[PDB]
Ligand binder design. Structure first.
Ligand code: HEM
Ligand SMILES: CN(C)c1cccc2c(S(=O)(=O)NCCCCCCCCNC(=O)[C@]34C[C@H]5C[C@H](C[C@H](C5)C3)C4)cccc12
Length: 404
């Protein structure tokens, strides 16, 4: 618990630990939602993890993400040391500069690329699902959620599938720290893999995402090797943990809700809507900004340098945005959320993400419509910048499945 800064008033103090929420065992989303109980301010300060603000309501969260002038992405993560060392592009960049890098990044992961990827996504999901189907069980997170996104990224960046385990080892030690490496060290190791590949793609460019980024033009001039590297770092990890963990939260829910599974089994056309409502209910991201100058925000005095956590996850869980937010209703009429962010940094991979989600849900229910959490298994959730599921043991009667 860091010393309380003089400018922060005692009545706004709420010591929430974003890395180890008090009631995590009851569900990570449930753990964060405590920040939304009637007796909690819209904006509080926690002395945990170095000390920082936390917008607790969709309104303030959306507003801060819109006001990039006061809320910079220069240092987007908590703790401060992680945010300061983080230099990915364009996530650690504020507009107007960020504008064109985002446009270049969009060429390789935006809507265009998606349609061309469908067949590979479709094929990968089925292939993975078919290998499990006859087994009658699996650790969904390990056997499907983990290898799905990386494989998609490899095809996207035109990298050898042989490097998957190595790349997975690199990203894993960065996003799932065990305490052996500082964030910076993990980043360098990851970069050490990318540096040479970019050098090669710059001299002899192909049609892969990496060749496009590395030879792109930004703000009236050629992108530097260093910048290309900083963009590829993000294009790599951006679609990993978020997709892996979200898919897990989804499957855990469906495994525990036979009623909801049947709904989608009988009404397959409702899967797209089910995906949006799940994206809201099981939102899992939470990064933030740093004050560029002293600023009064909704009656609260913020000082230059203050870090503010703007939980993407919380907007959609806000009762004020969605009636009885914790209830999953595939028939919800105005599903509002900021699961993919908000403002100038709104997720460029959102369309790819939705396809990965929808294809997974469609292809899985088609082959394994009836499954459950392994009896006696207590699902453990993890909290952080990208909350998730430690493991998802699943079981099912192979006789109720079918190869397609
Ligand atoms: C269910 C999965 C996903 C979620 C919840 C998610 C979440 C987010 C969030 C909340 C942001 C904005 C962060 C900020 O404002 O600082 C963001 C940005 C980004 N995401 Fe995703 N995302 C997902 C998947 C993907 C995938 C599939 C990729 C693509 C390879 C990806 C790449 C990006 C990129 C490039 C940005 C940076 C955009 C900018 O800074 O201009 N995302 N994502
Ligand atoms: C004692 N002190 C002071 C401390 C010191 C050191 C470590 C500590 C840890 S810690 O061990 O948990 N380390 C925290 C840093 C983990 C950063 C994860 C990087 C994610 C990369 N992905 C993104 O780019 C993205 C960017 C964007 C948002 C989001 C999803 C996508 C899109 C990918 C993230 C916790 C608490 C305190 C610690």
């Amino acid at each position: 618990l860091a010393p309380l800064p003089p400018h922060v008033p005692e009545h706004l103090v709420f010591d929430f630990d974003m890395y180890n929420p008090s009631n995590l065992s009851a569900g990570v989303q449930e753990a964060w939602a405590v920040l939304q109980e009637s007796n909690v301010p819209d904006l509080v300060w926690t002395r945990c993890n170095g000390g920082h603000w936390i917008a607790t309501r969709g309104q303030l969260i959306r507003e801060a993400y819109e006001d990039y002038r006061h809320f910079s992405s220069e240092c987007p993560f908590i703790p401060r040391e992680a945010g300061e060392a983080y230099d990915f592009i364009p996530t650690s960049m504020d507009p107007p500069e960020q504008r064109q890098f985002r446009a270049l990044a969009n060429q390789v992961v935006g809507m265009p690329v998606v349609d061309k990827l469908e067949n590979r996504i479709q094929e990968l999901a089925c292939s993975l699902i078919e290998s499990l189907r006859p087994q009658g069980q699996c650790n969904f997170t390990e056997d499907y959620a983990e290898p799905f996104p990386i494989r998609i990224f490899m095809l996207l960046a035109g990298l050898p599938e042989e490097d998957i385990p190595h790349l997975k080892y690199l990203t894993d030690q960065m996003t799932r720290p065990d305490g052996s490496m500082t964030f910076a060290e993990a980043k360098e190791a990851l970069y050490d893999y990318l540096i040479p590949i970019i050098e090669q793609r710059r001299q002899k460019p192909g049609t892969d995402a990496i060749s496009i980024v590395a030879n792109g033009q930004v703000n009236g001039r050629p992108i530097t090797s260093d910048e290309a590297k900083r963009m590829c770092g993000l294009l790599l990890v951006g679609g990993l943990d978020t997709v892996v963990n979200f898919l897990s939260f989804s499957m855990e829910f469906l495994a525990k809700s036979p009623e909801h599974r049947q709904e989608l089994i009988e009404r397959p056309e409702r899967i797209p809507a089910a995906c949006e409502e799940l994206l809201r209910r099981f939102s899992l991201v939470a990064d933030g900004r740093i004050l560029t100058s002293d600023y009064e925000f909704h009656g609260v005095q913020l000082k230059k340098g203050d870090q503010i956590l703007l939980p993407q996850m919380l907007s959609g869980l806000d009762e004020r945005e969605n009636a009885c937010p914790m209830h999953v209703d595939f028939s919800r009429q105005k599903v509002s959320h900021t699961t993919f962010g908000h403002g100038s940094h709104l997720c460029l991979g959102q369309h790819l993400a939705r396809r990965e989600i929808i294809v997974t849900l469609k292809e899985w229910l088609t082959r394994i419509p009836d499954f459950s959490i392994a009896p006696g298994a207590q699902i453990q959730h993890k909290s952080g910048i990208v909350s998730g599921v430690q493991a998802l043991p699943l079981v099912w009667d192979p006789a109720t499945t079918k190869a397609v």
